[PDB]
Amino acid sequence: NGIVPDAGHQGPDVSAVNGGTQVINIVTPNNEGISHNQYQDFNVGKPGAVFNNALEAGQSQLAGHLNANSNLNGQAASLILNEVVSRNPSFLLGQQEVFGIAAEAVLSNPNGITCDGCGFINTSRSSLVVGNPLFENGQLKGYSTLNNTNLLSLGKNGLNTTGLLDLIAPRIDSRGKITAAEISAFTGQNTFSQHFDILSSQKPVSALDSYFFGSMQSGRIRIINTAEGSGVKL
């Protein structure tokens, strides 16, 4: 019951639950190569979840044998954008696997995101965005944490991935081991490009406190807090 796709045009379809692991047929990539998937609820349990970006049947790590995704229409996604459209926050307690062609992945949930033992498999770049994507006539222009005060939380069991990692939120509270090739954490109220360049920043009414306890096993870490007067506690 963790992942509940939206009933609208950008809602993906669940094809199976294999050992508690939900398998999601992501929607057709647009001309930008972006599969924009919308959910009333996006949560991942300990069995994890699989996003099917495959043009051939094969073996997944989390859900066994899976089929090609006919939604792809012969073109795999280069970016899998998962967006929660409701007021429900997201809890990630397991791995998210991209089955098939490797792609970038973004979870966007302006209501809040909590990781605790979550991770990403076969992902070149993975982003957690407590904020909303910005679209202009159907094309992705970036993301926004403007007017948002919600929290990205990482629990004791941390987060692991072999690719790049982006953490975008008004504030971040981390208590676990973050393992990634590179870690980028951007806090405060900002507008971002598609590539998470900071295009603008605003000062929040009250302080946006970010907390980092725990290890960070990465060769490169960058933390940008644009909330003037706030800080990054370690």
Next chain:
Amino acid sequence: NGIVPDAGHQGPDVSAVNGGTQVINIVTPNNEGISHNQYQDFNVGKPGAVFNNALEAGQSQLAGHLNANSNLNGQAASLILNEVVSRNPSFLLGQQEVFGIAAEAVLSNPNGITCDGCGFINTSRSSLVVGNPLFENGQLKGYSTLNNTNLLSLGKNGLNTTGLLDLIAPRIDSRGKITAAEISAFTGQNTFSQHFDILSSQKPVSALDSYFFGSMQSGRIRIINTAEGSGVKL
């Protein structure tokens, strides 16, 4: 007794002690604009220390009225490089002021550096390097932490500056509030350019553990640990 200049050609001369604050006449800048100063001992107490990069007499913040530095020969330094040539580590318990023309400042001490309530005034960029500078026929080519396992320590009272801040050491242990326009921390055994670009990295025999407790009041923080297998604990 904190700052003891070397007797050789790159040893500066102390001109005064004003309220316990040592005033150092840095040596003539070379053609690169680098004043390369060598010390048998480099320590700063609570009264702080002043480096005289002035072409006119004026008022310093820490040491009252000071004169022009005749060592400059009419050309202020663009980089003040302070290097300990002995086995003595460095303890910085106060502010270091550049009197006169603003400049970049680097403290190089391969034996270790400890900050506790230290800071930098009228400095565009300030660097603490547990490592040695690299010279090629008198020209500065960069810095090196190769084969070094010593520690850069920041105590409870932290470090403050309005300019940029570089922290270069085989490992860093910080327990206080670091305030700076931007913070760059590079750990592991590396060779650096003059601008602290990582040119090469080597794996240490044993782990080089870096620790960051405490606040970091900066808009941009980057931490690069090139020691594979080691991590950054927060």
